[PDB]
Design a protein around this ligand. Structure first.
Ligand code: NAG
Lengths: 115, 36, 48, 238, 40
């Protein structure tokens, strides 16, 4: 997933910091993995209601961002060459090499054509 | 705001207004059916 | 119009947004231009 | 007005079912309504009318997400009226501006900003092409020269890293043309021909011959995280 | 097992490794649906 690989750790950090806060809240009115199980189940009541709401918001934000990124990348990358009208032909660098066979009609056309 | 949003906003009010009357008449219909 | 009024003596100096054409320049001298603009197409807004 | 619309709709839907539940009482207090409302999103014969509304809301949010995804697929100094040009010593990195000597824009700058020579003299060059390599190597920050030359340099630049400031900002246009000596009677013969060439399209067809050129999520996540942290801390306090 | 497999789509410590696979499959099918929508 080369779609901003530096930002994928942020999602993991976000989904990890919630677990310890949930466990602390549960301990302040279910020891090791119950909080993680509940979080993953709701990702798949006062404070608990707010936690569910923020988890739903996180899921909605994640799915919306994924859909937007996919839609953008489908058109921005991996969709060209036009021809003489392309200004890069008039100023060709070493990156692109234009070549043909000598003593042909192409040489005569290039010699006769202006600009 | 948008046309779809405006349509949904106009439709939900009519839907809930119709549903209130539907529930009110359905309660009476169920009570009458149970009485019979 | 304005060119006819100038040629008839009713006016001497023309200060207005007047374009530059070959026919106009063949009879009326033009000073330095103010701004460089062209012609565009105007279309009324269409609701979505 | 979607925000106010949903704000006034949530209040209505937080009682449209509470009234029915209260009428059915003769079930518990508003906690049930809150639970149902917050479980309705994502994943008794009166629940059909709220299930259909939930399905409609799911369709609406899917359409909103699709519209946002479709919309998501489609800076520097604003000109010479910035205080940085007047006082380049305000910031730790000094501004590196200059131009070739014995030119034409230097006198125009002098007639308007005569105090810029103290900085122009320290960054003078011996050629227009030296500005490009100076900028590439960091020896200069910007190049002050004619707009036409800059457009060609941007068009022929490798990688398109060089670009004119803004959307082609032009100040003191005074476009140049063909010069002619005093007293020459050929001005009336040449100006008409040049105007005819311009108006007949010779300039437009010859433009392509030479004038060739090539032409946030993080903030939202941070704001949402800050809002969630604030809600969590205020809930813990309360 | 058949019921769990057929209910896994859309909406004991060994269920974590199948729940993560279910989430990955949901992401995959969402991507497939997006690609199909964009292909039209
Ligand atoms: C500019 O003119 C001065 C005249 O004294 C001359 O010494 C200098 O070499 C000239 N510079 C360029 C780049 O022509």
């Amino acid at each position: 997933q080369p779609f901003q690989s530096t930002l994928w750790l942020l999602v993991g950090l976000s989904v990890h910091v919630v677990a310890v806060m949930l466990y602390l809240l549960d301990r302040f009115s279910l020891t090791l993995s119950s909080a993680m199980w509940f979080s993953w189940g709701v990702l798949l009541s006062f404070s608990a209601r707010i936690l569910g709401m923020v988890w739903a918001g996180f899921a909605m934000i994640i799915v919306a961002s994924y859909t937007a990124n996919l839609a953008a990348f489908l058109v921005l990358d991996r969709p060209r060459i036009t021809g003489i009208n392309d200004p890069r032909l008039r100023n060709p660098s070493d990156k692109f090499i234009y070549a043909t066979v000598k003593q042909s009609s192409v040489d005569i056309y290039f010699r006769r054509q202006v600009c | 705001t948008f046309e779809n949003m405006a349509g949904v906003f106009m439709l939900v009010a009519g839907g809930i207004v119709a549903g209130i009357f539907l529930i009110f008449i359905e309660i009476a219909y169920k009570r009458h059916k149970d009485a019979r | 119009g304005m060119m006819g009024e100038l040629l008839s003596g009713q006016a001497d100096m023309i200060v207005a947004p007047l374009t530059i054409n070959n026919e106009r320049a063949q009879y009326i001298e033009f000073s330095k231009p103010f701004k460089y603009q062209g012609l565009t197409i105007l279309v009324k807004k269409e609701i979505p | 007005s979607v925000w106010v619309m949903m704000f006034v709709m949530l209040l209505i839907v937080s009682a449209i079912a509470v009234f029915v539940f209260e009428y059915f009482s003769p079930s518990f207090t508003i906690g049930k309504a809150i639970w149902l409302l917050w479980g309705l999103v994502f994943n008794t014969t009166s629940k059909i009318m709220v299930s259909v509304w939930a399905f409609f809301a799911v369709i609406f949010l899917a359409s909103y997400t699709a519209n946002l995804a479709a919309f998501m697929i489609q800076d520097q100094v604003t000109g010479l009226s910035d205080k940085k040009f007047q006082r380049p010593h305000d910031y730790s990195p000094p501004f590196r501006f200059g131009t070739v000597p014995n030119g034409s824009t230097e006198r125009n700058i002098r007639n308007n900003y005569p105090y810029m020579h103290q900085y122009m003299t320290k960054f003078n060059q011996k050629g227009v092409e030296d500005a490009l390599v100076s900028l590439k190597t960091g020896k200069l920050d910007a190049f002050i020269y004619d707009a036409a030359v800059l457009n060609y340099k941007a068009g022929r630049d490798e990688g398109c890293k060089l670009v004119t400031i803004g959307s082609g900002y032009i100040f003191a246009t005074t476009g140049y043309g063909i010069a002619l000596q005093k007293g020459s009677p050929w001005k009336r013969q040449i100006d008409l021909a040049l105007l005819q060439f311009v108006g007949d399209g010779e300039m437009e067809e010859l433009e392509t011959c030479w004038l060739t050129g090539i032409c946030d999520n993080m903030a939202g996540v941070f704001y949402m995280l800050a809002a969630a942290m604030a809600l969590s801390l205020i809930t813990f306090i309360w």
